Design a protein around this ligand. Structure first.
Ligand SMILES: [Mg+2]
Ligand SMILES: [Mg+2]
Ligand SMILES: [Mg+2]
Ligand SMILES: [Mg+2]
Ligand SMILES: [Mg+2]
Ligand SMILES: [Mg+2]
Ligand SMILES: [Mg+2]
Ligand SMILES: [Mg+2]
Ligand SMILES: [Mg+2]
Ligand SMILES: [Mg+2]
Ligand SMILES: [Mg+2]
Ligand SMILES: [Mg+2]
Ligand SMILES: [Mg+2]
Ligand SMILES: [Mg+2]
Ligand SMILES: [Mg+2]
Lengths: 324, 118, 138, 168, 177, 52
RNA sequence: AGUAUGAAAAUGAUUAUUUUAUAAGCAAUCAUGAAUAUAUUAUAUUAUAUUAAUGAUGUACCUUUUGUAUAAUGGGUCAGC
RNA sequence: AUAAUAAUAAUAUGGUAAUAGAACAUUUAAUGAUAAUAUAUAUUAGUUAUUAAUUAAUAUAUGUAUUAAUUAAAUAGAGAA
């Protein structure tokens, strides 16, 4: 006999299992099972599907393997099947995230500016955030080599359970990164995995319970804290407020001193209110008068934009951003 | 009890009491009880019962304790744990014996999942 | 004119879907080594199976090493508790395992008096202001 | 001659060490450490040539030795590739050189002391105005940029614990 | 007044003037069970709260419009105008025709040092801002002005530059909310 | 001598007791075998070049 | 008083971070801002670590005594015994 | 009719001189797997109700613990002469 032959046949078996993701093997994988139990995924979502979601596309081994001298070696993963990876799933998950999150944000804040809305959406479902979520869930990367695994003589089940992409061995050894594309990044792979899981959930539940996916998203993605007030940065807000007042049936906004203390000091306090008629729109405190005025305008704009109506109200469609 | 303004308001706080210890909370807030919970395991949900005060920005319902029907307040038990281990030394002023008073009290991290006017 | 500030969301584990903090536990023992007796007994005696049945979201690795017997947990936040269970009986080991599973992974920390609630949320009522107080000072 | 991009990850210590420097060392100088300090504190962050000039016109005995050391460090820097008008003394310290021979001083009325005879060494690290100084200027600039301003009516943390109750 | 709830201060059992920070007194103070009106002791600057938003910014079908919580405590008659433009005090005027505008533009290009914005404003009974909106100066003049500004900046000490930076940071912070 | 099958709850498993020395020996044999294979191929290529 | 090795401490000089030129006492502890550093799950409104803003409490240790902050005993510091 | 662990109710838990019970560190002797993917020592940060040990990183040594554990013993623990 020969040990090379033994290793080779093991590798071939592993490749075959990757191509298939046979259901029994996937079921045997403890990590997959624990992930399934942790997230409370549907029973219709098979363990093979879950394994597939963790399998990123990796058809051909790249040219950068040829030289570890240039700071890269791809020796962990094994080639995947063209029609059994997380790629199609991932896209679907991304689409779902882009639809649902955005919709939820619009429901919450129907006048939110376009740029601000986009930023909020990004915050909710940015690649880094998605990667973090995946890590939290316990989607671990297949860092160990194939040869090493063979030597240890571990089953293929464990491999199936781990996340599988062209992860560069010696990525940041001796403090040297190679700056490769998105197809070799860990964060991206983790993002794909979390999107792929969502897509798989959608696939299994859509006919029985159409909104199951969206309630899962709400539980995991939309449950996260984001203060929308911290997102804004105005420029000349008084002018913008005046424009808004003009657009609506409101009197011209003027700022007026409500209260004042410590004028002729290092740190005064000036309270000014931007009135439109007798109604106050924005209240603004400040060290200077100018500052206070600015703050009142910004407050007014916040109140305009971040207005969140009740669920009992009929839908509020805003009349666009205030084009100054 | 006309509880309409509270119901309307987007922001809302509660001052529920566990063993007469008040904890002022909103939804998402992460309460740290200074004892080991025996009844609930980790993952279990706690329906708060002795809710003293339920407040908006300008109004507050108060009751001893507020009708359970009027509100919901679900905490989740998100980890039993402990405080950091400390060893203060106890000794008298011309005495070489120095008794070490070791201490490492228990904690229970709750998370206020739901808080709303029913 | 209005511009966004790039900002990211904060995950509150409990509020939507509770992800269980403890993700993996490794039982480590030695075949030699008299300190690993209680651990070995625990591994043998149908308790581990029951445990796994109870908690199917935790994976239970069982390893053999030359040193003292070890219980290393692994949590969602990425931290790792490792308890050496040298010379402990079966029941003590089980208690230790229970303690580990109970833990949210976070580091141990001194709390001051009444440092109870930890909010991301802005106050429902505002912050106090002397100009806006009900009773004016003198 | 390559299309491979890279990003380098270096500790603070690694950054410090890799900047071009030169390490002068004296021989076994006959002096006290205190006496050396009394001079060496003057030659803190000077340009090497300035320091050498100061040593030349100093009244002290260690001064000549210090000057010689500086000259040697300059020569070393030149040999390496550096310039003498670029070099500044980054660090310069002293230390005991060991094996100080004690020797009893006999006093009046059957009393004694012990006279030690101290030997020291001066080492110094010369660094470049062209790199190290530029780097620390850049760091200072970054720190200045980072620095949050003084706000007059600014958001200071309401220090103290809440106590499970609104006080407003 | 829609609601007729009794109103309460944030009451301590202790002397509030001497022990406002003492949480214990607040904890002690029990009040009879029911609904109350505790008006907030706060400015409504950073608040997105629904009790803080004005009625004009609420939607027409909002139930909250009718409820009396965006309280108009202040009065615009009593408050005096702060950093208000002369157009706002005495109304906007749209009197200058195209010919006048063209003349202004011609003047400004010709000699911005002689025919400055303020002078134009004085001549035509209109704002300096409006003059600016109407007409660009000769780009040379602008360049000169920029150079002068740069020279002034250079003339500063280190401290002054830092102070200016701090001021700029503060200004940026104002518009955050 | 526990195994993954012994526990009968699929989240429990026992990692394989393969001695470090044995693994090292296996590695040595495989890399050596590869080297042998390569060297023979290179020799053959040299012979072919020499021929024509 | 063997030979190698020696980031053991006391001790000296130097550099870095941080605090410090209107503040008074075992130099610590607890509260609590700020600044800096590290952090291949800081997702952050993050976590740890270092540091005499500021506040509160705080009469070295042993021995011997009815009783010691005592201005009663004894100790210059660390290492080995 | 025991032991270990966990519940509930009750009572008790300041301590000089003193009495009693239970542990740990260190060194040697008896028995004794294992191994540079290991062991030992040090530093830093975690972990276990913590004089102790353990995890990780880093450093230096060593082809390796008279190692875990149970016994037997002691030139067996030092801010106090
Ligand atoms: Mg006494
Ligand atoms: Mg004492
Ligand atoms: Mg020597
Ligand atoms: Mg004499
Ligand atoms: Mg002397
Ligand atoms: Mg008082
Ligand atoms: Mg001062
Ligand atoms: Mg003094
Ligand atoms: Mg005295
Ligand atoms: Mg004395
Ligand atoms: Mg003395
Ligand atoms: Mg006692
Ligand atoms: Mg002894
Ligand atoms: Mg000693
Ligand atoms: Mg002692």
């Amino acid at each position: 006999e020969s040990e090379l032959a033994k290793y080779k046949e093991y590798y071939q078996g592993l490749k075959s299992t990757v191509n298939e993701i046979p259901e029994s093997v996937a079921s045997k994988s403890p990590s997959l099972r624990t992930l399934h139990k942790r997230l409370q995924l549907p029973n219709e979502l098979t363990y093979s599907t879950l394994s597939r979601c963790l399998t990123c596309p990796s058809a051909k081994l790249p040219d950068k393997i040829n030289n570890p001298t240039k700071g890269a070696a791809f020796v962990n993963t094994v080639p995947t099947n063209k029609y059994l990876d997380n790629h199609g799933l991932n896209i679907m998950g991304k689409n779902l995230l882009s639809y649902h999150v955005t919709k939820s944000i619009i429901q919450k804040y129907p006048r939110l500016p376009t740029v601000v809305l986009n930023a909020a959406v990004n915050a909710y479902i940015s690649e880094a955030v998605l990667a973090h979520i995946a890590k939290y869930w316990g989607i671990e990367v297949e860092t160990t080599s194939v040869l090493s695994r063979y030597l240890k003589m571990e089953p293929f089940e464990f491999t199936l359970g781990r996340l599988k992409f062209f992860n560069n061995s010696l990525n940041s050894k001796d403090g040297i990164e190679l700056i490769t594309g998105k197809n070799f990044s860990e964060t991206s792979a983790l993002a794909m995995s979390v999107r792929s899981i969502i897509a798989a959930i959608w696939a299994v539940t859509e006919q029985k319970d159409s909104q199951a996916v969206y309630r899962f998203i709400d539980d995991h993605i939309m449950s996260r804290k984001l203060d929308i007030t911290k997102m804004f940065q105005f420029e000349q807000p008084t002018r913008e407020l005046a424009m808004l007042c003009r657009r609506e049936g409101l009197e011209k906004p003027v700022s007026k001193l409500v209260a004042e203390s410590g004028r002729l000091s290092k740190s005064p306090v000036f309270i000014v209110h931007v009135f439109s008629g007798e109604e106050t729109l924005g209240e603004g405190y400040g060290s200077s008068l100018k500052e206070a005025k600015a703050r009142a305008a910004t407050d007014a704009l916040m109140k305009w934009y971040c207005y969140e109506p009740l669920a009992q109200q009929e839908p509020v469609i805003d009349p666009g951003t205030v084009v100054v | 009890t006309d509880t309409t303004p509270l119901k309307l308001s987007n922001e809302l706080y509660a001052i529920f009491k566990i063993h007469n210890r008040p904890y002022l909370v909103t939804e998402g807030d992460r309460v740290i009880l200074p004892f080991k919970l025996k009844q609930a395991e980790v993952g279990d949900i706690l329906n708060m019962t002795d809710v003293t005060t339920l407040g908006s920005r300008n109004y507050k319902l108060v009751g001893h304790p507020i009708n359970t029907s009027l509100y919901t307040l679900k905490a989740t038990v998100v980890g039993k744990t402990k405080r950091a281990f400390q060893t203060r030394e106890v000794t008298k002023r011309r005495n070489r014996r120095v008794r070490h008073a070791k201490s490492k009290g228990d904690l229970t991290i709750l998370r206020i999942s739901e808080l709303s006017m029913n | 004119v209005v511009k966004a500030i790039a900002r990211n969301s904060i995950g509150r584990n409990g509020v939507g879907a509770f992800v269980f903090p403890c993700r993996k536990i490794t039982l480590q023992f030695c075949n030699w080594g008299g300190s690993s007796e209680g651990m070995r007994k625990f591994l043998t005696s149908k308790r581990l199976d029951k445990w796994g049945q109870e908690f199917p979201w935790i994976q239970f690795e069982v390893m053999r090493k030359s040193g003292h017997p070890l219980l290393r947990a692994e949590y969602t936040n990425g931290r790792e508790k490792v308890i050496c269970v040298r010379n402990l009986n079966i029941d003590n080991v089980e208690n230790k395992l229970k303690l580990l599973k109970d833990s949210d992974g976070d580091i141990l920390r001194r709390r001051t008096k009444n440092d109870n609630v930890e909010s991301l949320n802005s106050s429902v009522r505002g912050i106090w202001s002397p100009l806006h107080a009900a009773k004016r000072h003198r | 001659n390559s299309s491979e991009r890279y990003k380098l990850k270096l500790t603070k210590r690694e950054i410090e060490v890799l900047e071009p420097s030169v390490y002068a060392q004296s021989y076994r100088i006959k002096s006290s450490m205190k006496k050396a300090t009394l001079l060496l504190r003057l030659l803190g962050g000077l340009d090497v040539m300035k320091a050498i000039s100061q040593c030349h016109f100093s009244n002290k005995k260690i001064a000549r030795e210090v000057a010689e050391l500086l000259q040697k460090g300059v020569k070393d820097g030149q040999k390496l590739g550096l310039k003498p008008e670029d070099l500044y003394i980054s660090q310069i310290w002293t230390g005991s050189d060991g094996f100080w021979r004690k020797r009893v001083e006999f006093k009046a009325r059957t009393r004694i002391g012990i006279i030690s005879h101290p030997y020291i060494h001066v080492r110094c690290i010369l660094r470049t105005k062209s790199v190290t100084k530029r780097r620390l200027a850049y760091e200072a600039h970054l720190k200045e940029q980072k620095r949050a301003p003084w706000v007059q009516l600014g958001d200071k943390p309401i220090r103290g614990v809440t106590g499970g109750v609104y006080k407003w | 007044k829609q609601f007729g709830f009794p109103k309460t201060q944030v009451t301590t059992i202790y002397n509030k003037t001497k022990s406002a920070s003492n949480y214990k007194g607040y904890l002690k103070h029990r009040d009879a069970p029911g609904m109350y009106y505790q008006p907030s002791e706060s400015i409504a600057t950073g608040s997105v709260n629904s009790e803080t938003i004005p009625r004009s910014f609420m939607a027409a079908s909002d139930p909250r419009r009718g409820l009396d919580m965006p309280v108009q405590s202040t009065k615009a008659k009593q408050c005096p105008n702060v950093l208000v433009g002369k157009s706002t005090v005495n109304g906007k005027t749209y009197h200058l025709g195209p010919q006048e505008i063209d003349e202004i533009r011609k003047l400004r290009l010709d000699n911005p040092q002689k025919y400055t914005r303020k002078f134009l404003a004085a001549k035509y009974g209109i704002s300096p801002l409006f003059v600016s909106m109407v007409s660009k100066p000769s780009e040379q003049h602008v360049q000169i002005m920029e150079s002068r500004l740069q020279e002034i900046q250079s003339r500063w000490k280190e401290k002054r530059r830092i102070a200016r930076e701090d001021r700029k940071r503060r200004k940026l912070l104002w518009y955050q909310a | 001598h526990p195994f993954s099958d012994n526990y009968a709850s699929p989240n429990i498993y026992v990692v394989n007791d393969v001695t470090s020395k044995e693994q090292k020996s296996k590695y040595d044999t495989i890399m050596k075998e590869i080297q042998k294979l390569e060297d023979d191929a290179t020799r053959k290529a040299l012979e072919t070049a020499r021929s024509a």
